[PDB]
Design an enzyme around this catalytic site. Structure first.
Site, short mmCIF file in Angstrom:
data_model
loop_
_atom_site.label_atom_id
_atom_site.label_comp_id
_atom_site.label_asym_id
_atom_site.label_seq_id
_atom_site.Cartn_x
_atom_site.Cartn_y
_atom_site.Cartn_z
N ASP A 120 64.33 36.33 30.96
CA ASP A 120 63.25 36.99 31.67
C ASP A 120 62.06 36.11 32.04
OD1 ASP A 120 61.55 39.01 29.14
OD2 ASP A 120 62.39 36.97 29.01
N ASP A 132 62.08 31.15 27.65
CA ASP A 132 63.36 31.29 28.33
C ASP A 132 63.74 29.99 29.01
OD1 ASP A 132 63.88 34.44 28.39
OD2 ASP A 132 61.72 34.01 28.56
N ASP A 173 59.40 39.89 31.08
CA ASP A 173 58.34 39.01 30.61
C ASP A 173 58.06 37.93 31.66
OD1 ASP A 173 57.80 36.99 27.58
OD2 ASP A 173 56.44 38.09 28.90
N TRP A 228 51.22 38.34 30.07
CA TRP A 228 52.30 37.45 29.70
C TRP A 228 52.80 36.85 31.01
CZ3 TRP A 228 50.20 38.84 25.85
CH2 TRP A 228 50.70 39.50 24.70
N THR A 245 68.07 36.22 26.47
CA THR A 245 66.73 35.90 25.98
C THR A 245 65.67 36.85 26.52
OG1 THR A 245 66.42 34.19 27.68
CG2 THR A 245 67.32 33.46 25.58
N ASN A 261 61.62 42.61 23.32
CA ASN A 261 62.80 42.66 24.18
C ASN A 261 63.54 43.98 24.05
OD1 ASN A 261 62.31 40.14 25.23
ND2 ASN A 261 63.94 39.11 24.08
N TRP A 302 61.37 31.65 19.72
CA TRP A 302 62.32 32.76 19.82
C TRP A 302 63.57 32.46 20.63
CZ3 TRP A 302 57.27 33.99 21.94
CH2 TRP A 302 56.41 34.67 21.07
N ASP A 303 63.39 32.33 21.94
CA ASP A 303 64.53 32.11 22.83
C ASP A 303 65.23 30.78 22.66
OD1 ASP A 303 63.78 34.57 23.79
OD2 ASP A 303 62.79 33.80 25.59
CA LIG Z 1 62.32 35.85 26.94
#
Ligand SMILES: [Ca+2]
Ligand SMILES: [Ca+2]
Lengths: 315, 316
Positions: A10, A15, A40, A83, A137, A186, A248-249
């Site tokens: 996203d 990402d 996002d 964001w 992601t 997410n 995270w991703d």
């Molecule tokens: Ca993401």
């Protein structure tokens, strides 16, 4: 022999770090496509940045070109406006606007703009000769659409879904006046789609929930280490993005590159879809014969951090 | 011609650093003899570090003498939005500013610089210079005010001119808060009293780039993307990255210091609202007898400026 992979993202900074990890590791990953969702990020920007990164890499490390599609998925619960921009500014980053690379993107842009992301994901998975790993992601709306529309004909072609999302035995990160903080973004963006994915039989799922991603925060000293590699375009790119949160991703994509990143624990996961304070929460369900999801545990931080620095030296 | 002495008095946001690049890269026109950073539109510690990292990146890649950098002790009357001040922190982590050989040089000269008091440094640089000094102010006017309050004419007589980014005279300002009326501009709003001291100072030549002129040169994506044509130059990676993530406010101001052809000017007596009213921080025309004139910029040469910046970003 590398394995087929599709990135379902996203368009936020994380990402794109995930994209670089997948793309740079050509010995382990054959990136056959990517789709961008308007979650996002603003999808047009996410689309262009994906294109600019792919072309930069194609011209500098011979990464094969692949189709890129903008998903028609719409939010159940929109991400915060503050964001989403990021991808916008990245589209103007100098390292992504080198003439030879922009020229190539402008040449293939038009045909990629004809793809719709959800259908592209279905097609790439169903028409591939070997199975396909989907690295998700962003929200699970696209995998859910494929499941709903093609069912077993789609899932049978999926090697596994490696998903960034959820929070199992730790708090989430959706802190709103109407929520209790147990849901992760997410999943919260589209709970019903997530429920469809986590309850789908015959689909292998690896889940990087906050339980694991929380253990690898983005710290300045490590980010500054990309300054050791400014002769590499990807280090300028990754360093710039992380200089602007957790990995995270990136952790999710790292696992796709090498499963040594983390071990997993089988957990039957349901998703709360009712409009409750914990809407979007990923919870353990007691349902009989409910499919298992392999939740990542204790990720290998040093291994991941070294992997990213190394991957950013591909070119 | 010979280069003229300049001190950059800034507050560490993205355009302050573009301004820094413009000044430092034009060594035939500008002798950058020092810089100070204020805790306004940045957290001073980060702004100080980035100023040093950029200076060292340039010194290790081109002919550019090192200069002292000081942290101003100035405190805010009205702080900038938290969200905007963190950009220097982000820049502090950007890869192009963390190349080992450059960070090494900064670590080596850090001790000497972290001991300077920014306000006294500005006064000392200006007053002890053989020739007059031009002060390029891209943050609030707290430091020039401090110097005027402490040294009066002994300070102003050594200033060639003060080229200031700030104010809004006949157009709306940019301070949009529940308690304001929108007529004030941020740099002035941060410390209205200091701005009043500066604009009402007799014997000080002031060039003012107010929103009236800066509004005419917006930052546009196609132009910003042109820095991608020059990625073999560190400063192009740097400037492009900063403008990628609005108008060229501070940069226009510094460009004028490099070459006055950037803009012509109009004499206007400028006073400042210091009271806690909706228009606090507004720069207004005053009809007061004998009030000193400020030269307000008009019709900036946009193309000339855009080209100067692209070329300057090829210094290294
Ligand atoms: Ca993401
Ligand atoms: Ca400024």
């Amino acid at each position: 022999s590398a394995k087929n992979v599709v990135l379902d993202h996203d368009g936020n900074l994380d990402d794109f770090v995930a994209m670089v990890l997948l793309a740079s590791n050509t010995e382990k990953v054959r990136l056959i496509g990517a789709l961008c969702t308007d979650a996002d990020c603003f999808v047009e920007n996410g689309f262009n940045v994906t294109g600019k990164i792919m072309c930069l890499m194609h011209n500098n490390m011979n990464l094969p070109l692949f189709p890129i599609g903008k998903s028609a998925a719409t939010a159940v619960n929109p991400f915060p406006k503050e964001w989403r921009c990021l991808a916008k500014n990245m589209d103007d980053m100098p390292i992504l606007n080198i003439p030879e690379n922009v020229e190539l993107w402008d040449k293939i842009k038009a045909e990629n703009e004809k793809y719709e992301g959800q259908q592209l994901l279905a097609d790439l998975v169903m028409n591939s000769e070997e199975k396909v790993t989907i690295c998700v992601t962003g929200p699970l709306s696209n995998v859910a659409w494929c499941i709903d529309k093609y069912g077993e004909k789609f899932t049978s072609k999926v090697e596994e879904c490696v998903i960034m999302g959820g929070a199992v035995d730790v708090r989430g990160n959706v802190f709103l006046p109407s929520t209790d903080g147990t849901a992760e973004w997410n999943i919260y963006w589209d709970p019903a789609s997530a429920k469809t994915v986590f309850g789908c039989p015959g689909l292998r799922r690896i889940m990087f929930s906050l339980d694991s991603t929380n253990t690898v925060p983005v710290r300045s000293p490590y980010v500054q280490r990309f300054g050791e590699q400014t002769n590499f375009l990807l280090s300028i790119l990754v360093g710039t993005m992380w200089a602007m949160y957790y990995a995270w991703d990136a952790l999710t994509a790292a696992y796709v590159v090498d499963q040594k990143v983390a071990n997993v624990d089988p957990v039957p996961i349901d998703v709360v879809v009712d409009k409750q304070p914990n809407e979007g929460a990923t919870v353990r369900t007691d349902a009989e014969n409910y499919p298992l999801t392999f939740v990542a545990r204790n990720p290998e931080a040093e291994f991941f951090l070294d992997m990213l620095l190394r991957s950013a030296r591909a070119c």
